Design a binder for this molecule. Structure first.
Ligand SMILES: [Mn+2]
Length: 362
């Protein structure tokens, strides 16, 4: 299967600001032979929604085609349908939710017709996780096993529930569609129960679009915004969540924000950390900060410099020549205090490796 001999570490970054928001994002191919991730990041939507913003991560499987179409067109399918539009002036919460649902069902069918018409060869699919942010609400959107969360008042205020085939209601739909869940996989193949694309799994006669083996139906949750308490939102694929929990990543991201306001750097730190914790998947993360996101702290910055210097001195000493793996192993056995919460030693590997490289460049 995939797996390069060595991971592709190259970061694809973007950042922006507007509407009171700041964001950064990072995607990385990592250990996989193919890159099948995509994202959307836009502040200011067209057609009177200039005060609105939209961010999404798409985790492609069996190809990048579906993820790529979604990242460029999901938003317009969501906003340009009668359900979203309603209405009077400005969409109601119900307009937004129905509009999002209709957009998912319609882009799915759209791609299906395009493929049939052009005899498409790919059999790809994609998760989608995102937030549509209005002046007064954050609407979380989830379809698949990517995941998003909102940090408010230093805590995980909300996170999306992953769609897995073994989930009771998913299992039920799958079984009613003539299929089975074997361990965690639909008919022993697919490890997600909801996705755009995967049309081979949406061919059951006598069942509607949302009653197929795999469903394109998103789950949407409206959270009223809190200007005072809202801190940040994290959107990421399972490449991140497979190795870091909600609380851990929230704590870790806070610790990094206390050291720098460069959001691309914080996203890169998350991605590298997850690679070093053993993630062998593509990884994508979007970090969206609100006005009251944690601020850089002089004391945090000092502590980070102190820790870096301390690690540098440990490496010098441990090098009496042990390889990097053995140095990491020794450092781990020393139970070093004050490592980043959640990130731990893995989140300091870049600092450790840089010193190691200076001392053992060959
Ligand atoms: Mn993945």
């Amino acid at each position: 299967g995939a797996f390069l001999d060595k991971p592709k570490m190259e970061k694809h970054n973007a950042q922006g600001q507007g509407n009171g928001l700041r964001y950064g994002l990072s995607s990385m191919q990592g250990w996989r032979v193919e890159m099948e991730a995509a994202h959307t990041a836009v502040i200011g939507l067209p057609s009177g929604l200039e005060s609105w913003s939209f961010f999404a991560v798409y985790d492609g499987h069996a190809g990048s085609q579906v993820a790529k179409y979604c990242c460029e067109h999901l938003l317009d399918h969501i906003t340009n349908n009668q359900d979203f539009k309603g209405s009077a002036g400005a969409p109601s919460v119900e307009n937004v939710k129905n509009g999002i649902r209709t957009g998912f069902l319609e882009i799915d069918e759209h791609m299906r017709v395009m493929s049939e018409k052009k005899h498409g060869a790919d059999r790809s699919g994609s998760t989608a996780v995102g937030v549509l942010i209005s002046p007064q609400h954050t609407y979380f959107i989830n379809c698949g096993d990517s995941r998003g969360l909102l940090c408010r008042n230093r805590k995980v205020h909300f996170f999306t529930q992953d769609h897995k085939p073994s989930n009771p209601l998913e299992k039920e739909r799958i079984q009613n569609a003539g299929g089975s869940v074997m361990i965690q996989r639909v008919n022993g193949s697919l490890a997600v129960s909801r996705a755009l694309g995967d049309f081979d799994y949406k061919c059951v006669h006598g069942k509607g679009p949302t009653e197929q083996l795999v469903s394109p139906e998103p789950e949407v949750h409206d959270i009223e915004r809190s200007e005072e308490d809202d801190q940040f939102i994290i959107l990421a694929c399972d490449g991140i969540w497979d190795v870091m929990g909600n609380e851990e990543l929230c704590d870790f991201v806070r610790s990094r924000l206390e050291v720098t306001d460069d959001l691309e750097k914080v996203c890169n730190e998350v991605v590298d950390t997850c690679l070093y914790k053993g993630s062998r998947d593509n990884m994508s993360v979007i970090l969206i900060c609100f006005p009251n996101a944690p601020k850089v702290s002089p004391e945090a910055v000092k502590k980070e410099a102190e820790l870096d210097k301390y690690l540098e001195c440990r490496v010098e000493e441990i090098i009496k020549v042990p390889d990097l793996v053995h140095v990491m192993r020794t450092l781990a056995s020393e139970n070093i205090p004050s490592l980043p919460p959640g990130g731990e030693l893995a989140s300091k590997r870049n600092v450790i490796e840089a010193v190691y490289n200076r001392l053992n460049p060959y």
